[PDB]
Amino acid sequence: METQLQSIFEEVVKTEVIEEAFPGMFMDTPEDEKTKLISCLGAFRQFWGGLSQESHEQCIQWIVKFIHGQHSPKRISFLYDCLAMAVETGLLPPRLVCESLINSDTLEWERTQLWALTFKLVRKIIGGVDYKGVRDLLKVILEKILTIPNTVSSAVVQQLLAAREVIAYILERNACLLPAYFAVTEIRKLYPEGKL
Amino acid sequence: VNLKQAILQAWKERWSDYQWAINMKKFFPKGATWDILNLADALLEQAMIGPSPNPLILSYLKYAISSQMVSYSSVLTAISKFDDFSRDLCVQALLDIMDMFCDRLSCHGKAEECIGLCRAL
Amino acid sequence: QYLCQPLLDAVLANIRSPVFNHSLYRTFVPAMTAIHGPPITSIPSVLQGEVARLDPKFLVNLDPSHCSNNGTVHLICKLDDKDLPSVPPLELSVPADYPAQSPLWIDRQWQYDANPFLQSVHRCMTSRLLQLPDKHSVTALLNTWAQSVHQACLSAA
Amino acid sequence: KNKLFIKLTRLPQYYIVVEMLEVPNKPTQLSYKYYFMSVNPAMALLLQQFKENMCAFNKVLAHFVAMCDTNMPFVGLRLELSNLEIPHQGVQVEGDGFS
């Protein structure tokens, strides 16, 4: 079963990249690109159609460690589009993906393209979490942002700033993802009075 | 054969600017950077005959500047040889054409082309 | 291993002695020399390889401007093809240690304005650039440029 | 439901799928749509549609099949070169057009 997951994931990345690698009008660019993403989503749906509830999360930890083990950013973004359509179609509960994305210890700020694409995907899929999960995600995102130094390079700053849009989306009052009292409670638990 | 006949055929059958570029290439095997053949002069003559310029041949000249067919020096000389000045519309068209390449004005060629750009300025 | 072990134990016991090869000589050379007789009777060339193999559509030359004969190199290409229209020249910045990394396309947004056609060229080119695999060559950039010009001719008409 | 699956036999896991649709005004003409499927209980993997552009030959489908069967051997070679990290210019048309 672990081997089965490995096989499906490896073949999907390699195949989609290589057929698209040669651009012989293989594709029509607008929503047929969305259809190739649908194609990865269907391969993921077949793989999921075979698993128990208690085993629902260790496979997801394997998926995210396999995505974060990659090196090509196009490969990473292709598997993140697969994970996005796997959440959007209703196959995956949209809390396990976000938690295993952020709590993955390969997600460090030095992996700046991985940082940017990860927090882009969490900005995409955070709108469906219940509010207690949004509170725990707020806590772990703040603790991830807290590891950045006072000074970083001038090129990596915009890709680092992708977590700030997730934070701005959670603490936005009109979106109402969670009661704002929970947000200020988590913040003031992390930045108590007198701390910048 | 002549550049006037090629531009005028480009006006007769309505050619878009890139199709004009392709057929202008095909009519003339030696490119001669198009400035030996005075592309800017012929395009300005047959664009500035009316009281208002025809937008087709102005579109041809704006493509031939934005794409680097024609050097800025030949354009600035052909602009300099217009005067007349009784028509404000042709003068405004010439100032928009100058608004295209000015502040950029970068020759990348021989030093004689740079001296030509100096005299053209 | 078997039938050879005590030699291996002797020699591995006696490594790091400075008189080791003396000991081997004294114990082995007279037997061997009795039996066997006495002894015996500017620009990195990867880029020149790329440019030397390009199609005669492209006309790649070095920039008169920019630092020369140093780490990175800079190119101004061209495009000649009766089928394709004349287009802005394109500027490339090839790093030193060129393979194992991807060259960079110096973007000039201002000349890709002022026409709809050059705008379509530019949009399609940035699209195929995002579609490219990593650590691509120079010729991958030049061929995506020519394919972008061709798509922007076809999409327009 | 009117489709045709053309499996390539020199390299399986590759299908060209022809979908036939009725053009609305002309009742005696068809419209073809060519897709490129790949396959691993077999699973679909991806799909892309090709660009549009005695008549009983259908020259476009023969061209697409020949194009896939001569081009797709290079894709596996591109991947196996990239796994051993030999730097290469990509799969290119070489000199003349027909190579």
Side-chain angles (χ1 to χ4, degrees), chain C residues 78-126:
Chain C
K78 266 178 198 190
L79 196 80
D80 287 32
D81 181 356
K82 42 158 46 187
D83 316 337
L84 300 186
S86 60
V87 275
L90 200 98
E91 194 158 358
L92 278 181
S93 61
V94 172
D97 187 344
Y98 160 58
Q101 83 173 299
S102 60
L104 255 183
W105 167 45
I106 291 182
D107 188 81
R108 293 291 160 80
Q109 181 54 251
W110 56 267
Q111 42 183 350
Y112 281 100
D113 212 4
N115 279 318
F117 171 72
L118 308 186
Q119 274 163 336
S120 46
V121 165
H122 179 80
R123 289 189 279 100
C124 175
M125 203 192 312
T126 53

Side-chain angles (χ1 to χ4, degrees), chain C residues 3 18 22 26-27 42 51 65 69 78 83-85 101 107 114 117 124 128 136:
Chain C
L3 280 80
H22 172 56
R26 193 172 61 182
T27 191
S42 79
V51 166
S65 55
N69 315 344
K78 266 178 198 190
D83 316 337
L84 300 186
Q101 83 173 299
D107 188 81
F117 171 72
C124 175
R128 315 261 77 84
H136 47 270

